[PDB]
Every structure is written in C-alpha cells, then in structure tokens.
Amino acid sequence: MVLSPADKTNVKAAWGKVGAHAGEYGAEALERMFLSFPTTKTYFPHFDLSHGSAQVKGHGKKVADALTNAVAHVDDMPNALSALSDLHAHKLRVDPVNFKLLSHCLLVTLAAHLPAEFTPAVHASLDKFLASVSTVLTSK
Amino acid sequence: MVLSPADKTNVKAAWGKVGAHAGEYGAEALERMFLSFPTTKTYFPHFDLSHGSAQVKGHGKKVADALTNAVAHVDDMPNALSALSDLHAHKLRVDPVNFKLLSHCLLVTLAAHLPAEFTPAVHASLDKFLASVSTVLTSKY
Amino acid sequence: MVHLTPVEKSAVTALWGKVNVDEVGGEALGRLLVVYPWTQRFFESFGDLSTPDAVMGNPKVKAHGKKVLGAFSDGLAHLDNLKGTFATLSELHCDKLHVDPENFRLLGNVLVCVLAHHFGKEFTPPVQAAYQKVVAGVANALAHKYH
Amino acid sequence: VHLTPVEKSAVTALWGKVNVDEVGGEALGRLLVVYPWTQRFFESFGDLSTPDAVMGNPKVKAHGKKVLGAFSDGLAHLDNLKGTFATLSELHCDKLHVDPENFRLLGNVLVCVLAHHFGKEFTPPVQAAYQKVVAGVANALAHKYH
Numbered sequence: 237m238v239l240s241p242a243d244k245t246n247v248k249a250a251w252g253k254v255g256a257h258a259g260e261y262g263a264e265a266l267e268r269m270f271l272s273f274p275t276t277k278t279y280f281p282h283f284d285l286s287h288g289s290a291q292v293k294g295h296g297k298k299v300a301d302a303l304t305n306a307v308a309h310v311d312d313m314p315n316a317l318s319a320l321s322d323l324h325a326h327k328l329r330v331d332p333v334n335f336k337l338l339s340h341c342l343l344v345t346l347a348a349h350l351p352a353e354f355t356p357a358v359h360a361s362l363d364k365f366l367a368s369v370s371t372v373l374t375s376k
Numbered sequence: 377m378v379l380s381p382a383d384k385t386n387v388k389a390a391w392g393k394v395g396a397h398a399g400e401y402g403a404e405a406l407e408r409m410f411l412s413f414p415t416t417k418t419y420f421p422h423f424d425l426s427h428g429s430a431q432v433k434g435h436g437k438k439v440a441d442a443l444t445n446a447v448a449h450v451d452d453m454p455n456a457l458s459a460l461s462d463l464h465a466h467k468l469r470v471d472p473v474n475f476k477l478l479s480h481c482l483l484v485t486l487a488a489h490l491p492a493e494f495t496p497a498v499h500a501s502l503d504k505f506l507a508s509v510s511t512v513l514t515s516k517y
Numbered sequence: 518m519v520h521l522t523p524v525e526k527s528a529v530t531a532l533w534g535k536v537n538v539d540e541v542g543g544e545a546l547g548r549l550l551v552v553y554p555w556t557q558r559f560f561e562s563f564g565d566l567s568t569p570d571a572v573m574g575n576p577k578v579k580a581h582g583k584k585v586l587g588a589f590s591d592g593l594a595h596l597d598n599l600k601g602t603f604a605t606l607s608e609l610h611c612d613k614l615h616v617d618p619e620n621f622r623l624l625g626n627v628l629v630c631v632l633a634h635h636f637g638k639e640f641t642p643p644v645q646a647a648y649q650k651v652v653a654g655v656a657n658a659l660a661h662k663y664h
Numbered sequence: 665v666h667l668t669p670v671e672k673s674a675v676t677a678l679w680g681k682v683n684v685d686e687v688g689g690e691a692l693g694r695l696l697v698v699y700p701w702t703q704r705f706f707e708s709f710g711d712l713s714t715p716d717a718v719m720g721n722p723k724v725k726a727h728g729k730k731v732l733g734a735f736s737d738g739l740a741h742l743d744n745l746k747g748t749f750a751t752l753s754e755l756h757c758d759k760l761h762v763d764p765e766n767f768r769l770l771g772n773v774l775v776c777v778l779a780h781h782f783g784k785e786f787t788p789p790v791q792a793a794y795q796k797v798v799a800g801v802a803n804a805l806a807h808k809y810h
C-alpha cells in the first residue's frame with residue numbers, strides 16, 4: 237500500500253505492545269493459519285506443525301521479528317525485506333492468497349490479545365501495513 | 377510489485393510507442409471495460425457511455441496522460457499521483473477490483489495495437505506498473 | 518462448507534450464544550466500512566460516515582448491523598444450505614446491488630476479527646477454523662447467482 | 665453468464681481462426697512469466713527461468729495445447745460448463761491445490777493473447793463475449809470450492 241502518517245504511528249503503537257510476545261503471537265498466527273486454511277501447510281512439507289511444536293514456535297519468532305524490522309523500516313520496506321522477497325517470491329514461490337491468509341491470522345491474533353488497542357482505526361492501519369509487507373514479499 | 381530497473385526500462389520503452397495515440401488507446405480501454413464489465417459503468421453515472429462518446433473519448437486521454445505522467449515519475453509515484461489518490465480512493469470510493477479490470481482492459485488494448493512491443497517480458501512489466509499505479513490510487517495517505 | 522465437524526458445530530453455537538445480536542452486527546459492518554473505506558459507497562443513505570468514530574457511532578449502521586447478524590445466525594441455523602438460505606440475499610447483493618463478491622469474504626473476516634476482539638483466548642484457533650468455514654460458505658452462498 | 669446469439673457467433677468465428685498449436689502454450693507461458701508463483705505447480709516442466717525459456721519450453725507449449733482444448737471444449741458446451749470441467753475442477757483444487765484466483769488470472773491472459781494475435785479484430789464487444797466465457801470457465805473450475 238502507501239501508508240498515511242496516521243497509519244505509520246498506529247502500527248508502531250499497536251505493534252509496540254506486542255513487545256516480548258512476538259514469538260507467541262507469531263506462533264499463534266501460524267497455527268491459526270494452518271488450521272483455518274490447511275492448504276497453507278503445503279509450503280512447510282517436512283515440518284512439525286503440531287500444537288506447541290518447537291518448529292512452529294521458532295518459526296513463529298522468525299515471522300514476528302521480520303515484522304518488527306518492517307515497522308522500523310516502514311518507509312523503506314522493499315530494501316529492508318529484499319532477502320525475504322527473493323525467498324518468498326523467487327525460491328518459495330508463495331501464492332499471494334497465502335499472504336492474505338496469514339495477515340488475517342496475525343490480525344485475528346492481535347485482536348485476541350490486545351482487546352484495548354485493537355480499535356477500528358488501528359485495525360485499518362495494521363491491515364494496510366500487512367498488505368504492504370505482503371506486496372514486497374510476493375515480488376522478486 | 378516494486379518495479380525493478382528492468383521493469384522501469386520496459387514500461388518507458390513500450391509506453392513511448394504509445395505517444396500520440398494516448399487518447400485513442402485510453403478511450404478504447406475505458407470502452408473495453410465498460411462493455412466487458414457493466415458494473416463499472418456506475419462510477420460514471422452522468423457520462424455519455426455510447427461508442428465514440430465525447431465524454432468517454434475525452435476522459436480516456438486524461439487516463440493516458442496521468443499514466444504518461446506516471447511513467448515520467450515511476451520512482452516518485454505516490455506524490456506525482458497525490459491528486460488521483462484522493463479522487464479515486466477518498467472521494468469516489470472505487471472498489472479496488474475495478475483497477476484490476478481497467479488495467480486488464482488497458483493491457484488488452486496495448487496488446488491489440490503494439491503486437492511487437494508486447495513481449496511476454498513487457499506484458500509482465502506493464503502489469504506490475506499498472507498494478508503499482510492502482511495501489512497508489514487506492515491508498516489514503 | 519467444508520463441513521464443520523460435530524465439535525466445530527458445538528464450539529460455534531456456544532460462542533455465538535454470548536454475542537449480543539443487537540450490537541455486534543453494527544460492530545462488524547462498521548469496521549468493514551472503516552477498514553475497507555471503499556465499501557462506504559454502498560451505504561451513502563446512512564448519513565455521516567467520514568470518520569471512524571462517526572461510522573461506529575452512526576445509528577443506521579448499527580441498525581443495519583443487526584440485519585447482518587440476522588442473516589448470519591439464520592445461516593448458522595441451517596448449514597444444511599447457505600445457498601438456499603441466502604438465495605434471496607444473493608440476488609439482492611449480486612444482481613440488484615452489484616457488490617463485488619470479494620467484499621463478502623472481507624465482511625466474514627471482519628466479523629471473525631470482531632469475534633476475536635470480544636472473546637480473547639476463548640476464540641481459540643480451532644474455534645477460528647470452524648468460524649472460517651462458516652464465513653466462507655456464507656460468502657460463497659451469497660455469490661452463487663454470479664456462478 | 666450466457667452469451668447473446670451475436671456474441672456466440674463472434675466468439676466461434678474468432679476461435680475458429682485460433683492457431684491451436686500455439687495460443688494455449690503462449691497463454692500458459694505468459695501466466696508463468698507474468699505470475700511467477702504459478703511456476704510452483706510446474707517444477708516438473710524443466711527450465712522456466714527466463715521468458716524465452718518459458719515460451720520456448722516444449723512442455724509448456726505441449727501442455728498449453730491441452731489447456732486450449734478444455735477451453736475449446738467449454739466453448740462448445742457453454743450451457744453446462746459445470747460438468748464439462750468437473751474432473752479438471754476436482755484435479756486443480758484437491759490434488760493440485762491451485763488457488764481459484766489463478767483460474768481467473770489465466771482466463772485473462774488468454775484474452776490478452778487473443779488481443780495480441782487478432783489486433784483490431786479483437787474488438788471491445790468480442791472481448792466482452794470472451795470475458796463471459798473465461799469467467800464461466802474459471803467459475804466452473806472452482807465449483808469444487810462451492
């Protein structure tokens with residue numbers, strides 16, 4: 237997308253209260269994705285995707301930290317995520333629907349931990365953000 | 377979509393061959409859309425939408441020039457298109473599916489007129505471009 | 518669809534019994550309007566919709582919100598066929614309203630985001646999965662006479 | 665979405681001139697070039713690494729012909745696309761897990777290929793007729809999800 241200054245703050249604030257819960261939320265969001273949309277598992281063939289699994293956990297953390305670094309470089313995401321882009325778009329060839337699937341599950345995950353800060357405005361701002369991240373990661 | 381250097385070269389090169397035919401190509405693309413996808417006509421509830429129409433053909437050149445202007449500022453687009461962002465996203469509230477439709481119709485137009493430029497590589501380049509244009513016109517910033 | 522297992526069928530009504538059928542409808546639709554601003558073109562008859570709190574505060578959105586849940590609860594009743602249950606509604610939304618069917622998916626996602634906002638960790642991943650099956654079948658039903 | 669009698673005629677009039685050895689493989693090829701994530705379904709097909717390699721790929725062109733066929737098949741059976749594509753639907757959704765948006769993408773690349781091939785003669789109302797076809801095909805190929 238193209239983030240409004242109001243988006244940029246709301247996203248840093250909202251993803252500011254995740255803090256140490258990054259690997260928990262990212263673990264939840266993945267599991268939510270894998271259950272709700274089982275096709276997504278197809279990209280993790282030899283993975284242990286069980287509840288509480290160590291791999292979903294470790295991977296959950298890797299997801300969440302990428303986002304934390306994204307929010308940081310929000311004005312320059314394509315440069316910041318250029319390694320991840322080649323991975324998800326050139327090596328892994330992930331179908332764009334899957335990014336919609338995971339962004340929804342992160343959004344659902346945040347709604348269920350941050351009941352206070354997850355207002356209509358911040359929800360919208362987070363949506364734009366995750367869309368923007370999805371855009372970068374789907375292109376070479 | 378972020379438009380590689382290769383993309384930027386391919387769009388300029390194939391949008392150049394448009395040139396004088398800007399209004400012609402633009403008019404046709406809007407027409408292709410209006411007929412292929414009836415639901416899009418309602419964003420122009422006061423337009424004369426008949427074949428050849430002075431409104432259609434006149435509007436299509438504005439599209440083509442906003443695009444020429446977009447090609448001119450590929451690296452600086454959300455500012456070059458700041459007006460159109462509020463026009464289409466804020467005020468007109470256009471469903472983003474439509475930009476997919478017009479970009480397509482634009483592509484189909486360009487494939488009809490420039491059959492030597494429309495290599496698969498350029499097709500791809502033009503797609504990422506049009507969809508980049510569309511992303512800006514559907515953003516509130 | 519896909520089907521909802523008996524456990525999924527039992528986890529869903531349980532949660533759906535705690536949701537205020539008179540206030541959470543306007544909560545879902547309201548966020549659809551603010552999260553996805555282009556959908557505000559379908560509800561121009563509803564007066565002020567220029568700011569988040571206004572859209573949430575606009576009374577007609579609230580009142581029209583209840584009708585939404587109406588249809589959804591109605592669809593919860595008969596997972597037998599959402600297609601038939603939403604035949605009337607499909608024709609209204611599709612042929613007469615020209616609402617792009619992707620917006621169906623979005624409402625069913627905002628709804629799910631809204632359920633998650635109320636019920637915290639009671640909205641577990643398996644409860645989410647079950648609901649995703651419901652908002653999918655419903656969005657698919659509504660878009661049946663485009664097929 | 666049901667073509668008109670003059671739409672149906674323009675449709676078959678144009679399709680009857682379509683080089684069935686080429687077009688299918690040019691559309692699938694451009695799908696692969698324009699939408700590179702679709703390559704994931706085709707690791708078996710060999711070199712898909714550059715546009716030219718994709719376009720010149722013998723497996724792309726070959727398989728493309730089978731694509732065109734099912735389309736042609738649907739062009740004759742416009743009144744029941746559901747059953748006509750019922751097996752391919754089963755195939756693309758449950759074994760292949762292709763997301764239904766890609767069916768719509770491919771249909772639109774076929775329309776782009778047609779425009780490339782028949783220039784002016786791929787007129788706006790002809791395109792509209794074809795849009796109703798590829799939509800119907802894409803809808804039929806996704807009936808599995810329904």
Ligand code: HEM
Pocket residue numbers: 276279280298299300302303320323324328330334335336338339366369370373
């Ligand atoms: C906001 C969206 C996403 C973010 C921020 C993200 C971020 C990441 C990160 C940080 C890694 C670590 C790998 C590395 O650094 O080498 C990774 C790997 C990976 N991602 Fe994601 N990703 C996203 C979306 C997706 C989606 C939607 C899918 C598929 C459903 C996906 C599939 C994969 C796969 C298959 C790997 C490699 C697995 C392995 O290690 O074997 N990604 N991604």
Ligand code: HEM
Pocket residue numbers: 416419420438439440442443460463464468470474475476478479506509510513
């Ligand atoms: C490549 C994509 C697009 C470009 C470059 C573009 C550009 C433009 C331009 C240059 C104008 C002229 C504004 C003026 O001078 O008054 C305009 C107006 C307008 N645009 Fe487009 N636009 C695009 C997509 C769309 C789509 C897909 C729709 C709806 C189907 C749309 C709806 C409108 C409407 C309703 C107006 C004003 C018409 C009126 O006066 O009522 N735009 N746009």
Ligand code: HEM
Pocket residue numbers: 556559560562584585587588589606610614616620621622624625655656659
């Ligand atoms: C996906 C789930 C949806 C459900 C269950 C649903 C259900 C309903 C119901 C029950 C009504 C009331 C009909 C009446 O009272 O005559 C209605 C009306 C309406 N719907 Fe929704 N619908 C859905 C999706 C959408 C979406 C996504 C939009 C727009 C973005 C939309 C736009 C409208 C409009 C404009 C009306 C009539 C407004 C009025 O009467 O003033 N629908 N729908």
Ligand code: HEM
Pocket residue numbers: 702703705706708727730731734735752755756760762766767768770771801802805
């Ligand atoms: C949009 C209309 C489409 C049509 C008419 C179509 C038609 C066909 C046909 C006729 C076959 C041959 C199956 C067999 O011989 O048993 C096939 C297989 C296949 N389809 Fe397509 N398809 C479409 C869309 C897509 C898309 C968009 C993708 C990928 C993004 C896809 C992925 C595949 C794959 C991987 C195969 C089998 C290749 C192999 O077995 O090596 N399909 N389809």
